[PDB]
CSV table of C-alpha atoms (C1' of nucleotides) in Angstrom, one decimal:
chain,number,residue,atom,x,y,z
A,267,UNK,CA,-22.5,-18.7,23.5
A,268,UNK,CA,-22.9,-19.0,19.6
A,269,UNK,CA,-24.0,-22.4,19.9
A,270,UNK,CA,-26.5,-21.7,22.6
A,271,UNK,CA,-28.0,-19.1,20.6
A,272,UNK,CA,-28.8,-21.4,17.9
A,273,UNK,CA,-32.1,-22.6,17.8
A,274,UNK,CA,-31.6,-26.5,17.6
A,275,UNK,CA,-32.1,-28.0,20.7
A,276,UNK,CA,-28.9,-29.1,23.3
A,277,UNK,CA,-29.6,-31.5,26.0
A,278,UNK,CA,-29.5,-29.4,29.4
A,279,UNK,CA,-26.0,-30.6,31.2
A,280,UNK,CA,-23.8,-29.0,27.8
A,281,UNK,CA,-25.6,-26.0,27.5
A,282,UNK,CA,-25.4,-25.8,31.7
A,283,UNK,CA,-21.4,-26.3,30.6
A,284,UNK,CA,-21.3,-24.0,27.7
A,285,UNK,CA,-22.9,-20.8,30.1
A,286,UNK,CA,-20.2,-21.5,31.9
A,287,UNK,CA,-17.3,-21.5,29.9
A,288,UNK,CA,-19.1,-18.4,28.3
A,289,UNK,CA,-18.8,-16.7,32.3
A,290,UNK,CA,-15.6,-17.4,32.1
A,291,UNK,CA,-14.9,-16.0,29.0
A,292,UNK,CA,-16.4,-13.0,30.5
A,293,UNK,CA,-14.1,-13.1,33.7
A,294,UNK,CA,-11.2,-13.6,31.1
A,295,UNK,CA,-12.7,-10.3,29.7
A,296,UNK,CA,-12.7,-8.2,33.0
A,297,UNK,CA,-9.3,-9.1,33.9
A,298,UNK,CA,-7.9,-7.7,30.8
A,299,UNK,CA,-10.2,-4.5,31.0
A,300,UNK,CA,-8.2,-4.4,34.9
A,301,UNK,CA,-5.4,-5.0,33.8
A,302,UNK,CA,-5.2,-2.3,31.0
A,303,UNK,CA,-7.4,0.7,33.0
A,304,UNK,CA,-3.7,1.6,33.8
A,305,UNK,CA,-2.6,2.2,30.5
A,306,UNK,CA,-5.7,4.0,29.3
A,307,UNK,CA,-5.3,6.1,32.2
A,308,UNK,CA,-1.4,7.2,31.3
A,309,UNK,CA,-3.1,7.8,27.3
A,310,UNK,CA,-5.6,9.8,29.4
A,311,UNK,CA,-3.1,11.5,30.7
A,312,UNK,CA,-1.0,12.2,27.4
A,313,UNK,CA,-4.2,13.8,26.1
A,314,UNK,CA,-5.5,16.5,29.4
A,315,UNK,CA,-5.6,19.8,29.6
A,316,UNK,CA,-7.9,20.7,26.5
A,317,UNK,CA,-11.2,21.3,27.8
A,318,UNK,CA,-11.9,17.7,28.8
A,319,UNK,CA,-11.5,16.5,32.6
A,320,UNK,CA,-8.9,13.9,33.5
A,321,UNK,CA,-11.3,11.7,34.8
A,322,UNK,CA,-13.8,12.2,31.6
A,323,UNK,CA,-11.0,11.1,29.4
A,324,UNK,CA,-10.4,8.1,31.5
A,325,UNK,CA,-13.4,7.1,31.3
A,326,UNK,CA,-13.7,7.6,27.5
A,327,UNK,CA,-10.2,5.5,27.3
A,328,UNK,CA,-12.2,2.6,28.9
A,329,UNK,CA,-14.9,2.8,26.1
A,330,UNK,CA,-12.2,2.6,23.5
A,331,UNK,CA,-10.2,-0.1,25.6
A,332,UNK,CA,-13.5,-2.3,25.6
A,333,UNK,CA,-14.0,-2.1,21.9
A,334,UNK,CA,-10.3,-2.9,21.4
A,335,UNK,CA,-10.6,-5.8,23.7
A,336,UNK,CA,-14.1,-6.6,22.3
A,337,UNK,CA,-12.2,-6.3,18.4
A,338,UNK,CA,-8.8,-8.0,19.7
A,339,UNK,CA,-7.8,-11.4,19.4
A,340,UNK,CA,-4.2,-13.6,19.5
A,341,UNK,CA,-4.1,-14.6,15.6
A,342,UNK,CA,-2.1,-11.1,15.6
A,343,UNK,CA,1.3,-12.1,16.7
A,344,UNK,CA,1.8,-8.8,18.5
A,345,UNK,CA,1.0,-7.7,22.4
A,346,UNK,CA,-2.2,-6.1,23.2
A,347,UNK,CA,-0.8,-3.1,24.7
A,348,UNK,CA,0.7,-1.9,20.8
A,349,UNK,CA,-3.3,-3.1,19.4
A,350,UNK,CA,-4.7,-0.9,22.1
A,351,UNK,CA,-3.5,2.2,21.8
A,352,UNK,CA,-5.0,3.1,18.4
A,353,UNK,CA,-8.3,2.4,19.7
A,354,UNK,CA,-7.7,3.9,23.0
B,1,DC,C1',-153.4,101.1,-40.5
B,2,DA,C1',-152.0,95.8,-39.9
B,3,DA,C1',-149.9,91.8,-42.0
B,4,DG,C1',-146.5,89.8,-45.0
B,5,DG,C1',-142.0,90.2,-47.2
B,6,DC,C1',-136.5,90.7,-47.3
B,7,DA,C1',-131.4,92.3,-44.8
B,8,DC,C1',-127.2,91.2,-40.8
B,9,DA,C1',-126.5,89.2,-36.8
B,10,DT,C1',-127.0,85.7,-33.9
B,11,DG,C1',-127.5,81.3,-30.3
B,12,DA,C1',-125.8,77.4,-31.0
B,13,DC,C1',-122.6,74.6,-34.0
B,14,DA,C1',-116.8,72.0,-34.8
B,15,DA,C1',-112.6,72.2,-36.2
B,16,DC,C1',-108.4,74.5,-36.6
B,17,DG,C1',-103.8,77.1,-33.7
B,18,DG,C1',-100.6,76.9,-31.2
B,19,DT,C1',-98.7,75.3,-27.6
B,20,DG,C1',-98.4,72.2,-23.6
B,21,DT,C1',-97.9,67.8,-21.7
B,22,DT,C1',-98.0,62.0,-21.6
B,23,DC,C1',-95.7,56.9,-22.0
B,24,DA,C1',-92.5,55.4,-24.1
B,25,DG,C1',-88.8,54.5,-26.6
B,26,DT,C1',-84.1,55.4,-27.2
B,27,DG,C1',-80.4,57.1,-26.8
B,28,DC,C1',-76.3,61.2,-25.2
B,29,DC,C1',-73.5,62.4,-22.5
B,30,DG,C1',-71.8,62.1,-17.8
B,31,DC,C1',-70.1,58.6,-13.7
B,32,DG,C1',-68.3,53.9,-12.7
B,33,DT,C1',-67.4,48.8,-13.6
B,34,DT,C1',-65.5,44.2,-16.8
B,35,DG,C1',-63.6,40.5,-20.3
B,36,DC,C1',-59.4,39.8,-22.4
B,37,DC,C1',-53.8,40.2,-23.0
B,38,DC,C1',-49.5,39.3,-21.2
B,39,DG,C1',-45.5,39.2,-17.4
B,40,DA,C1',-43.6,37.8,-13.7
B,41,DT,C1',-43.3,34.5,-9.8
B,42,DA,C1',-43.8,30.5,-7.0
B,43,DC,C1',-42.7,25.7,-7.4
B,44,DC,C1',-42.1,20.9,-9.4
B,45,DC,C1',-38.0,18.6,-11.7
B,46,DC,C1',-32.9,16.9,-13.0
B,47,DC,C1',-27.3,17.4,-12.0
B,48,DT,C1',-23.2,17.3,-8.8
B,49,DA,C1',-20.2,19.7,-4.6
B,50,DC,C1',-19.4,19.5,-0.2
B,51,DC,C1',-20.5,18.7,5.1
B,52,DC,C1',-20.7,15.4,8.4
B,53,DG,C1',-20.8,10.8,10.7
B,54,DT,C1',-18.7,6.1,11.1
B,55,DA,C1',-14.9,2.8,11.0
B,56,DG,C1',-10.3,1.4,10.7
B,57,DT,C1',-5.0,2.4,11.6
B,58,DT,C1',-1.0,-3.5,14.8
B,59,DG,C1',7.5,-3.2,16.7
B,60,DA,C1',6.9,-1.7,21.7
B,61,DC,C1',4.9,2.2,24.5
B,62,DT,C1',0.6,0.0,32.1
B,63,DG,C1',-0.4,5.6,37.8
B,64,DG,C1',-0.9,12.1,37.4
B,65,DC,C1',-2.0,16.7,39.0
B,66,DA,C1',-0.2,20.6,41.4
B,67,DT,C1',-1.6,21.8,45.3
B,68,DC,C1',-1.4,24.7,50.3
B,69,DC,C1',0.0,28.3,54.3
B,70,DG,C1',0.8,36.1,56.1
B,71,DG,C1',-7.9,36.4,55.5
B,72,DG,C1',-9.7,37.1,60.2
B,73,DC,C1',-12.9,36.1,63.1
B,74,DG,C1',-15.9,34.3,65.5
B,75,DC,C1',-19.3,31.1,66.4
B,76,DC,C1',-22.0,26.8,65.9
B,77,DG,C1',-22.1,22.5,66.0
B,78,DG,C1',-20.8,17.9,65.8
B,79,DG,C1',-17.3,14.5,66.0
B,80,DT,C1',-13.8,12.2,68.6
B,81,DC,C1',-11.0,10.1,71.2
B,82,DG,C1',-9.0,10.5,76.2
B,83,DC,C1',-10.7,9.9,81.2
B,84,DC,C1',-11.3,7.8,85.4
DNA sequence: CAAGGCACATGACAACGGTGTTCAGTGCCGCGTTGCCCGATACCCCCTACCCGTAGTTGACTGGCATCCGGGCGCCGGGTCGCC
């Protein structure tokens, strides 16, 4: 997706390929978000019971998991779920 | 005895007496209005102290919560699956 923003001009077929590496990207994306609404909702859960409802801080988990996700990457050597949790 | 001569007073004649009025000019005391002079007060500046919003923090840590019955009472009204 960086190189199809940039202006200079790709023949069609790559930048047909490159959307679609970039959807997948984006697939990759939701199935980590999936896979970690459990956690956020146990750190939801660590955290009720002080004015907030249950389902409020879930939801507030998932904005924090998707700016983790959005701000994680593998060049840490560590899992995601220890990265997440601050954020979370 | 009648006519002509001299005294005192007399029809007017202005000008003083004394006092009252005229324009006018200017003040003389009463009532009210005015420039100062300051003094405080709103209103620009500079300095830093502190409130408040944003962004990171990497061992691992991946599904909870306690409900709820002793109304009581009846009806409406619809749903809901058996029934033959």
């Amino acid at each position: 997706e960086d190189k199809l923003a940039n202006s200079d001009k790709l023949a069609p077929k790559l930048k047909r390929e490159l959307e679609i590496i970039a959807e997948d990207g984006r697939r990759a994306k939701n199935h980590l978000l999936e896979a970690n609404l459990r956690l956020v909702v146990s750190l939801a859960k660590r955290y009720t019971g002080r004015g907030m409802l249950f389902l409020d801080l879930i939801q507030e988990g998932n904005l924090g998991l998707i700016r983790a996700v959005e701000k994680f990457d593998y060049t840490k050597g560590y899992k995601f779920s220890t990265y997440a949790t601050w954020w979370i």
